[PDB]
Every structure is written in C-alpha cells, then in structure tokens.
C-alpha cells in the first residue's frame, strides 16, 4: 500500500542533526584542531569535507528517498549481486549498539552523580583514592587526578580488574542506569517515527540550549580567551604533511556517518519529491557547525584551566571520553554553582547520544520491517526483544573490567568494516547502478540533475577518499592495547571475527545468489545487475 | 547550436496512426528530458508527454495516455512519438523541447511538425 | 489539472509605453517552477523567463518577471516593436504539465 511518512519535515531534519551530532562533536573535532595547526586544519578538514565527506552524505540521502525501503532491500534493489552490502550495514549498526549505549549510561550516571552539594570528584581524600592521587591533571603516568581516579576506582571499579580476561563483579548501579537507557530508546523508537520524530525535539534540541549556557559561563571566567587561542591559532605548516589530511579525511567520514543504513532509512520515509539536496546541505552544516561552536564551549573552559589551576595545556587537551568525564567536569568543580554546570552538561551528553543510538537501531527496524512482514506487523514486539539482546550481553559492559570489553567492541565492530562497507556502495551507485541512473532519479525527484561536480566526487574523489583512509589505517596498524595492558592474541582475533562478519556478508551474498540464478555467466551478472526498477 | 528537428507528420483518417520524429544535434541528447508539446490551429499549447534522460520515467498528458507511446533513441539520438488511434482534435502542430531543469522550462524548441486527422 | 488563465487574450500598447500582463493558476505554484514563453507569429516558442523572474539568455534587460502562490505577472518597461508577440506561462510543478492560455501583445498605431 502506501508507506508512511515523518508528521513533518523538521522531524526529518532533526532525526537527521540529532544522528550525526553525537559526542564525537565535543571531544574530537575540537582536539583535532588544536592538535592540527589551529585554524589551519579547517582547510584540508572543508576539503576533506566537501570533496568527500558531503558527496557520500548526500548520496545516501538521496537513494533513500528515492528507493523508499531499509538497508537490506533498498541495496537488493539497486544491484541484486550486492544485497549483502545491506546486510553487512545493518550488522554492524548492530555490533555498535551493544558498546555506545554504555556510553551514553556513563552520562547518566555521573548525573545522577550530580545532585549534590559537593560534586564527588573534587578532592583525594576518599576510600577510592591512591596516594598518588592528585588535585588536577599532569603528565606523569603514575598521578591520576582526582576526576581521573573517581571515573576509574569509583565509577569503573576498573582498577579491580587484570583486563579482558578478568571482567569481575556486575555493576549494578551501571546496568540500571543502561537499563534506563533502553526505556528511554524504547517509548521513543516504540511506535515508529510517529512518536520518534517528536522525541528528538528534545533530544536534538536541548543540546544547543545547554551549549549556549556553557559557551557564555565559559567565555566569561577568567584565561577564557587564552583557551581559544589553543584552539584556533593558525599554523599552516601542519597542512604540509599527510597525516593532518588523514584526520581531517577519518573526522568528516565518522561525524557525518554515511552509508550506515541510518540517514537511508531516515529519508526512505521522505516524500518523493521533497528537496532531498537541500536537506543534504543544510544538516551536513549544522553538523559541522556544531562541532566549530563546540569547540569554544571545551577549550574556554581548558584555557580557564590553565590560567588559574596550574596545569599545562597539553596535559588538559585530550580526546575522547577522558575529555567529557574527566577534564571538563574536573574544570565545572572549581567554578561557582558546579551542581549546575554538571547537571546540565551530563544531560546534554546523554541528549547527545540518544539522538544516534536512535538513529541506529531505526536501521536496522526498517531493514528488518521491509524484508520480513513478521517483523514489520509486531513492531513493538521486536523492538522490545532487540532491546532486551542489546541489554542482557550489556551487562558484560557493566562488570569492572566491562571498559575492556567496551574498547575492543569500538576498536572492531565499525572499524575497517564500515569503510569496506561504503566503499562498496560508492562503486555500486557509481558503477553498478551509474551515476546516469542515479542522476536520473534525482532530477525525477527535485526537479534538476546533480551538478557535474558531484557526479565526479561520487565516481573518482569518493572511493579514493576511502581507501585514502583504509590505506593509512592499515599502514598504522598496533595490537589492541589501553594504558600497559596488552590484549591477548586471542582477544584481538575475537574482534577481527565482529570485524569480518560483516563485511563477509558483500562477498557471501554475492556468491550465494551469483550461484543461484541460471544461464551463462554473462547472463547471470546481467539478470544481478538489472536494477528493480529497470525491470518493471 | 542546439538543434531540434521534427519530422513525419501529415494527413492521417480517424482512428489511424503515426509515428512522429525529432532529431536532436549541438548537445548531449542522453543527458536532458524531452518533451512533446503540441498546438491546436485555436493556437492553446498543451503538453502531451515527457521522457526522462534515460528513458526510465515518463510522464503524459491525460488526453493521450493509452494512445501516444514517447520513446528515444539515445544512440541515434532521436525522440519518438508514436500515435495510435487517432482522433479529429489530435490535429495540432507537434514540438519537440528539451527540458532537463523542471526549474528551467524548455530552453530549446523545434519547428514543428504538423498533423491532420480528418477524414 | 493546474489551470494557468491569462489577462489579457489580445492588448495593445504604443511603443515606448508600459504593457503588464497577469497569469493566474488554479492552485499553488512555487516560484522556481513558472516560465514565461515568447511566440511570435509562424514561429515557434522561445523560453523567455525561467523561475519567476530570470531572463534566458538573449532576453533584452526591458523584460522582468514577479509573482508567487497563484498570481504571476510579465511586464515590458519601454515595449518595442520586435515584442509584438504571444505570451504562454507555464507551471512545471505538477504533472500534467500546463500553460496558460497566452496574451497577444499588439502594436497601437
């Protein structure tokens, strides 16, 4: 019959903003460019984003609009022989629900941590300190800071733990705290995008009110504009050597999370003729934008650090979780009304990551309702099953060592195996299907072909673009390891088995149904490669 | 330098058919739609039916759908109108028009060719 | 079926003067959708104003466009003999696609 369709268009765009604006935004963006020459690294970062990183969003954007199904038969569609790449995605936007989940616990818990008089993480006087515990952080490996030992011997217990091996006690104060997290993704994913489409209102909103109370506390405390320079001072030498265009390349792929079934499902419940190129642009920039602002709000508060905690910048500038639930709430404890200051900003680092894991699991619902009518009648009934496996192995998560587990999931889930994974859909459209076909589609949509610059990106920069990743990702290659502990041999495999088995499903499918359909092999390609609609 | 050229055309009887032609020239005829407009001697424009670049989507007037069948060689580079089951009210003079950009109408246009249904 | 009407049928101006004329949709048309077509007498049409307000290539700077919704308008400043023509408008939003019934522009003498 008749698909359904977002209650609005500002539902879209927020599904949209609020997939790809996760924490990635805050404690990596910011980093890369005080880390990258300032200022300078935006110039291969907006050609990295422009040349590649927008070109791949657009075109997701757009073949899911236009083919109107999940990952799974939406890929069946445009190319039989390659069906496998919709498994391939949907799988591993299964792998990462299990880790990032845990992650957006973690913002739960330090909020709940909060509501207090005196945030817990100021001193060095407490049952979980060493006596190597210090007030603020340093560059001696052996000296955790107050934050770093409460995140470590509080929060994680993960001191108690030998490594992968030894995963020790259930944190239950953690599983609860996952546990509501799974509630909030469920009456918010529970009846489609009815309902989700409203929840990110919140969740993709309430992040800009919260940055913009933190972007004015933080540049008006005291070494506030000293932050800024760190951040932003020009050094173009750094553009010069290949590594900043690596990390300009890495940053715009993963912040903008193309050809990971998610903006395909999202804009498969579009209207045929909607914009579907405007869209493109506008949330890719706000998504950017994002990040830039961001960046005022950490490194106001880093410089503040600096100027009257006595710490030295390099030793506050970090990436990553260690940012947000180390440094930052480290700096919130020292100003006056911290309560606020923390209970705000854990809230918007959940609200951060709600918006994404939202995005995938609708993924894999809509793949997995589009093929299987089962699935698709008893919506609620698979979500709550989906939700109930993304639990109970989560509680593995929530054991001492559970930050082990965690590392390794991050390492190898979406690892080299979404890069495989896109690369193959940039050749499919392009090659396979023809950027002809595809533009032809487009201008049947909004009117008008995609410029001649895009057709270019999508069939030369793009693929080159990916493999310019691949191939100095490989070529940095290092055993699986975090703070002395070595992952064992077997440990290390393990996760090249998660790696794999997604991307084993292009190569499988191909040849369980190239296999299965009759006639020469010239016969059968063609018969795989006769798109759906070129059929009808 | 754009060219369009249409051709077949003539004195047809109720009920017969015909198949009309435009040659396109001076640009990349794979890369744009086509359009057939035609005009009645009361001199109204009505458009009658749209191909896409690639053949794949097609589009026509409600007067004609079931009769008129457009098509294009993009080898030979020839757009194709093939009228069946004429009628008197058909007669008109048919145009050939590029228009790639629904947002920016056709750009290019034929002489025309002209039919007659009458008995 | 998007019905463009268009005032006046036949009109005529003196060189020099300035001639306005008006096309009115049954429903809604974006902006970026409405062109204009000039026909002089035995020839054929000439795209002559694309998106509501854009003159293609070879249109004089006399000629402007304005409009939105259901209500368009082409207007000459200083018409000129050479402009004796019809005027079609066109829709190009929804199919089937549909031009207005046109405007003779004739010359006073």
């Known amino acids: 019959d008749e698909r359904e369709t977002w209650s609005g268009k500002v539902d879209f765009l927020l599904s949209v903003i609020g997939f790809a604006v996760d924490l990635a935004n805050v404690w990596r963006f910011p980093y890369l460019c005080y880390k990258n020459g300032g200022g300078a690294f935006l110039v291969p970062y907006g050609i990295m984003l422009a040349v590649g990183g927008i070109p791949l969003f657009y075109m997701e954007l757009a073949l899911g609009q236009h083919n109107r199904k999940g990952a799974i038969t939406c890929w069946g569609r445009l190319v039989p022989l390659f069906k496998g790449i919709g498994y391939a995605v949907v799988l591993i936007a299964f792998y990462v629900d299990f880790y990032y989940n845990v992650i957006i616990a973690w913002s739960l818990r330090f909020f709940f941590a909060s509501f207090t008089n005196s945030l817990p993480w100021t001193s060095c006087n407490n049952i979980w300190n060493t006596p190597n515990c210090r007030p603020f952080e340093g560059h001696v490996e052996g000296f955790q800071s107050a934050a770093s030992e409460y995140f470590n011997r509080y929060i994680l217990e993960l001191n108690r733990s030998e490594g992968i091996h030894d995963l020790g006690a259930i944190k239950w104060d953690m599983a609860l705290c996952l546990l509501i997290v799974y509630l909030i993704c469920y009456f918010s994913l529970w009846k489609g995008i009815s309902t989700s489409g409203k929840v990110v209102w919140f969740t993709a909103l309430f992040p800009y009110a919260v940055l913009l109370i933190l972007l004015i506390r933080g540049l008006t405390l005291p070494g506030s504009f000293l932050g800024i320079q760190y951040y932003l001072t020009p050094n173009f030498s750094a553009i010069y050597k290949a590594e900043v265009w690596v990390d300009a390349a890495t940053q715009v792929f993963f912040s903008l999370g193309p050809g990971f079934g998610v903006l395909l499902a999202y804009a498969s419940y579009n209207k045929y003729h909607n914009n579907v190129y405007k869209d493109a642009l506008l949330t890719s920039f706000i998504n950017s934008a994002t990040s830039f602002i961001a960046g005022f709000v950490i490194f106001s508060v880093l410089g503040y650090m600096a100027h009257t905690l006595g710490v030295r910048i390099e030793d506050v500038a970090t990436e990553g979780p260690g940012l947000v639930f180390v440094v930052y709430p480290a700096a919130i404890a020292t100003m006056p009304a911290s309560t606020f200051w923390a209970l705000i900003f854990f809230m918007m680092l959940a609200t951060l990551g709600l918006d994404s894991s939202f995005g995938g699991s609708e993924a894999i619902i809509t793949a997995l309702s589009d093929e299987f009518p089962k699935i698709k009648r008893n919506r609620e009934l698979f979500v709550a099953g989906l939700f109930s496996l993304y639990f109970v192995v989560g509680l593995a998560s929530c054991t001492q060592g559970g930050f082990y587990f965690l590392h390794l999931l991050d390492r190898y889930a979406a690892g080299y195996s979404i890069l495989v994974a896109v690369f193959f859909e940039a050749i499919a459209v392009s090659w396979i299907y023809g950027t002809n076909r595809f533009s032809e589609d487009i201008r049947d949509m909004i009117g008008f072909p995609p410029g001649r610059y895009w057709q270019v990106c999508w069939r030369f920069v793009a693929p080159i673009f990916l493999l310019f990743i691949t191939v100095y990702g490989l070529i940095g290659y290092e055993p699986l390891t975090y703070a002395d502990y070595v992952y064992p041999s077997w440990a290390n495999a393990l996760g090249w088995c998660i790696a794999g088995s997604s991307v084993v499903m292009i190569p499988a499918v191909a040849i369980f149904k190239l296999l299965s359909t009759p006639g020469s092999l010239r016969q059968r390609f063609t018969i795989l490669t006769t798109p759906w609609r070129d059929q009808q | 330098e754009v060219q369009l050229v249409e051709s077949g055309g003539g004195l047809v009887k109720p009920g017969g058919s015909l198949k009309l032609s435009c040659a396109a020239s001076?640009?990349?005829?794979?890369?744009?739609?086509m359009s057939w407009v035609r005009q009645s001697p009361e001199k109204r424009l009505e458009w009658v039916a749209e191909?896409?670049?690639?053949?794949?989507?097609?589009y026509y007037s409600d007067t004609v759908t079931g009769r008129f069948t457009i098509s294009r060689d993009n080898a030979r580079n020839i757009l194709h109108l093939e009228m069946s089951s004429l009628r008197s009210e058909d007669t008109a003079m048919y145009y050939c028009?590029?228009?790639?950009?629904?947002?920016?109408?056709?750009?290019?246009w034929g002489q025309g060719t002209t039919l007659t249904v009458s008995s | 079926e998007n019905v463009l009407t268009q005032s006046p049928a036949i009109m005529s101006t003196s060189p020099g003067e300035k001639v306005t004329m008006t096309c009115r949709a049954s429903?809604?048309?974006?902006?970026?959708?409405l062109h204009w077509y000039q026909q002089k007498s035995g020839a054929s049409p000439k795209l002559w104003i694309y998106?509501?307000?854009n003159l293609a290539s070879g249109v004089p700077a006399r000629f402007s466009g304005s409009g939105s919704g259901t209500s368009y308008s082409l207007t000459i400043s200083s018409v000129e003999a050479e402009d004796a023509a019809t005027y079609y408008c066109?829709?190009?939003?929804?199919?089937?696609?549909?031009f207005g019934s046109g405007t003779k522009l004739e010359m006073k003498r």
């Open positions: 028009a590029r228009g790639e950009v629904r947002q920016r109408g056709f750009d290019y």
């Open positions: 001076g640009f990349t005829f794979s890369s744009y739609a």
């Open positions: 191909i896409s670049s690639g053949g794949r989507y097609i």
């Open positions: 429903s809604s048309v974006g902006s970026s959708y």
């Open positions: 998106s509501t307000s």
């Open positions: 066109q829709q190009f939003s929804g199919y089937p696609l549909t």
